[PDB]
Design a protein around this ligand. Structure first.
Ligand SMILES: N[C@@H](CC(=O)O)C(=O)O
Ligand SMILES: N[C@@H](CC(=O)O)C(=O)O
Lengths: 426, 426, 426
């Protein structure tokens, strides 16, 4: 197994590791070894989750610069508008679908938390203008060294536009200086893609361990409200993939049933790794090999959509907010519905392509809309039972995130006439 | 539409923006729209301030490394000693002007502000040696993140000197590596200059918004002895321009009237944007096109003196601390005034080149007169009105700061015989 | 005269610094002047510690990147991986011998300059696995900012390996971008080596000031424990040679006495010239003649060996970290005695060629093990002494470095059957 392992195709490796981890977790729960797997196996899962975070800031700083500097600034404006309007519209529709399914399945209806009416009057703090300001970084190095991906995306796009303006300057000193800066960033982006492709070789172990621990420990609590919220979130993600992307691809002229069988390379790799930004190379190659989108369009829309376009995270937050609110004996309202429609999206735009950041930004959206939790509050008792099925729904959440990443680049490229129609026919 | 506005020559549209903002603020104070302006108009000003602060660490680090690495070791040492003794001399003389002006105006006396002086009487020096040690960055990346300007200036200078020493090695691998590092930093500085060009093209709207909000809210509040502060600060500035610069220019030979005629471009573009590191391009342009100064002088002095040389911040700090100390009813003795001078100089250096930074650094000199910034105390009740007038105070501050940086560059140039004397002839 | 100051050997200069520091401190403490040396003198020796901490993080990141880019599974053949595994293994065992002998001699036991029993008593030590998977950084820029050494050594090694894997790609843009990124990091490492040269030139004054303040405020017996640290390091080096190689050499089937009775020509000149890189010519000469190793592999094992295989420096760090940890008061624990091993080995993988590499690679280990070097704490006072006797430890640790390189060459030659066994008869 010295190289039979490392040579095996990484997709089938992860897809095998997932099922082995599932069966092994169920068996370790059976034989009663929950603590055993929590002590001896989970450290490798945590190592994987920590490996998938050194590949978020370098790969979003050095890939946006190279993507935005490799486009004419006018085409960059046009493509960026066409793709950001799509990201926002689809995240909005995702939250809408999440709220619909959360109302339909009646998520968390019989939780029996003993909390009749905790708190709902603080539903509307969602500072909008302050966030649209916070996109701009008061200090770019602070936004890098603190973990905020949206300010560093803004600064990286600005730097890319500046470099592509420099590379057309009369002097030769500034021309070569800007070319060298762009080459530094190109080298960094490529080195990060290579490190990600190397971490993926360890992924068939660090996802084995993660799902082994999840199955072992929380394989029994998915019976009532938890099974209902899992069913709700996954039916919502299915509804999204079947309605939103399919309508958007049919109204433009892209066979959805073909787009899916083309994206099945990245859908899976994001489904099991649970990191829409650690599966970025597979997306940036499945959007160029199969779908044929030009290197100009995807190389900027995908490194941006990998972090700011999270339809699945929007949907998961929209469903779990309704869950935790029905868990405190007082559902949302119409006003609270639209408050979520905005706050969940303004949180999706922020959360990074990290395994299990949806839970953190979910706690954030709760601390926004009324349900403020203290370390002993009933809202906290309700939200704490979500981090159990965290992974079991994070998988589908990330799958929909990446599928949406792909069906936006395809739309933009089909509009811009940069879609190789020779690839879209059999 | 836009391209018409985008070509209207800036520095002649930003002034129109500022005057429209003054008119709008007065009209809003008339109709009592302070809240409407603060909620609709101010966010553009906040965005402009954040865009200005975004370009303070990268532009300083990059332009300073390039400047220090492009001159010489020895010529850099000489220019550095001359320009540092110049900045210290002018800051000291400016604080002396500030103190004598605050005394001559009887500022903050008839205000009969609270006399709660029971804990803020014991004055203490600023621990000078501790600051001179703080100049050395304990961790250069931590000093880039936390947004400290003097440690990053020190690291940039030492790195530039080291790169110049490297570029002379007999080897070739290390010479080419040094050239590549320096070209990275050159490209970064040039990209930051383009970004500042774009921000300053946006600056009409931002200036309109900021000064409109101010002249709406504080358009009626500056009637009483608070106008004494404006008179004092503006008199100190107007005379330090015509007593310190108009003498230091006649001792060395530069005709000061021609100096003003030539520096107008960088004067009325920093009087309205209130940022020294946001007029660094509109200063490095004038000190190369109209002043006629060698590139290897103003390419280091101006990025250096952008932050450490703040004569108007020093004068403003002196006058304002005198105002507060008179507001609580505690005068300053002649001996204590020297402590105030030294702390105002020390707070001029380590102040950011951003709008409204001296007011934030006003506490650093308020501590050295023994005063304390505890809430509810009269000290805060005067600091509030100071923060109110901060807008116009900072406009004047930055204008005289940039004029001082220009005059210091010109002095170092003429004493180095690099000042191209063919531009100073009628 | 300052040229004579810069011309005296940097290491033998710090020893006179330490000796005059001890003498001047004893005098000023016996004649009632402790305040004088603490207020006037001491800030020199504090600026020195600030200058040492300024250089750790850049010389860790930028040097590890180039180092790991010279040691890569993508440019290491069969002979390469053998010698690199041997180098890392023997450096690990050398740090372990250093820690063992430091525990045996009980170095720095009676220094007593520790403040008390504990400032953050028991420090809540994380589990061993929680500090084994705390090597991978969740954010590489945050680990640069917060000044963590292992989460940036790991990221730098990963980036370097990826960069080597790039420069062998069939493309041209990617290969060129990787070459440019490596040029950037090479230039940064060289600039840091220049700054380290300058700081170590300043180090006599800094060490003199630090030790003078120490001896003035409290008698700490600088002569006793240091006379024990030198003895402990030399016993560790003798043990390192005897055990670590005489075991390995006899395991791989080579007479150890027949190896030592030949390498004596290189050990002596490595002892005297104290520059392993400068001793490389005669090292290759002896490995050619006496060891009978063919040119094909000591043309590669010795050059690489004299720059990444620092067994003597590894043992020096292993012992002086124990000395510092036992001096400032709280002994060193397993969860830390393994971090010391990891950081010592993974920095030897990128050892700088400069007089003063042990000093930096010890400030780094004291920063990574959790004994932060800092301006004033007993860590700086117990680290200045080791920086003092650096010039006594160097003459032996260089001998151990060169003998380790020779033993590695002979071992790798035996495991591949290229021994001129006609040189090993009687
Ligand atoms: N980890 C997901 C986001 C989430 O699940 O919150 C992603 O990579 O986009
Ligand atoms: N506005 C000043 C800063 C300050 O006044 O604090 C400047 O020129 O940067």
């Amino acid at each position: 197994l010295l190289r039979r392992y490392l040579d095996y195709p990484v997709l089938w490796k992860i897809l095998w590791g997932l099922v082995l981890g599932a069966v092994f977790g169920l068996i370790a729960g059976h034989f009663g070894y929950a603590g055993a797997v929590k002590t001896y196996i989970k450290p490798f899962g945590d190592l994987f989750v920590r490996l998938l975070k050194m590949l978020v800031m370098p790969i979003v700083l050095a890939s946006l610069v190279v993507g935005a500097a490799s486009i004419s600034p006018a085409r960059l404006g046009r493509v960026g508008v066409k793709i950001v309007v799509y990201y926002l519209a689809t995240s909005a529709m995702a939250v809408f679908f999440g709220l619909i399914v959360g109302r339909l399945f009646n998520v968390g209806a019989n939780v029996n938390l003993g909390s009749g009416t905790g708190k709902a009057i603080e539903a509307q703090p969602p500072s909008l203008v302050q966030t649209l300001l916070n996109i701009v970084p008061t200090n770019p190095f602070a936004s890098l060294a603190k973990g905020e991906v949206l300010p560093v995306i803004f600064f990286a796009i600005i730097l890319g536009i500046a470099i592509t303006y420099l590379m057309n300057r009369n002097e030769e000193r500034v021309r070569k200086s800007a070319e060298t800066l762009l080459r530094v960033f190109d080298g960094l982006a490529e080195a990060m893609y290579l490190i990600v492709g190397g971490v993926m070789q360890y992924a068939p172990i660090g996802v084995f361990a993660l799902i082994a621990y999840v199955m072992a420990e929380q394989g029994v609590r998915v019976v009532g409200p938890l099974a209902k919220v899992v069913g709700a979130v996954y039916t919502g993600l299915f509804l999204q993939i079947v309605i939103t992307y399919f309508i958007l691809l049919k109204v433009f002229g892209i066979d959805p049933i073909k787009f899916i069988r083309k994206a099945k390379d990245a859908m899976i790799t994001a489904f099991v790794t649970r990191s829409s930004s650690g599966t970025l190379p597979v997306t940036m190659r499945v959007a160029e090999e199969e779908m044929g989108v030009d290197k100009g369009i995807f190389s900027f829309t995908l490194p941006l959509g990998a972090t700011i376009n999270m339809d699945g995270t929007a949907l998961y937050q929209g469903v779990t907010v309704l869950f935790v609110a029905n868990a405190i004996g007082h559902p949302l309202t119409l006003g609270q519905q639209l408050v979520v429609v905005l706050t969940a999206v303004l949180a999706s735009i922020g959360t990074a392509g990290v395994p299990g950041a949806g839970a953190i930004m979910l706690a954030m959206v709760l601390q926004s809309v009324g349900l403020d939790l203290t370390p002993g509050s009933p809202v906290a008792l309700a939200y704490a039972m979500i981090l159990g099925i965290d992974a079991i729904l994070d998988m589908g959440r990330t799958m929909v995130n990446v599928t949406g990443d792909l069906a936006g680049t395809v739309i933009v490229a089909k509009t811009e006439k940069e879609l190789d129609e020779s690839k879209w026919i059999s």
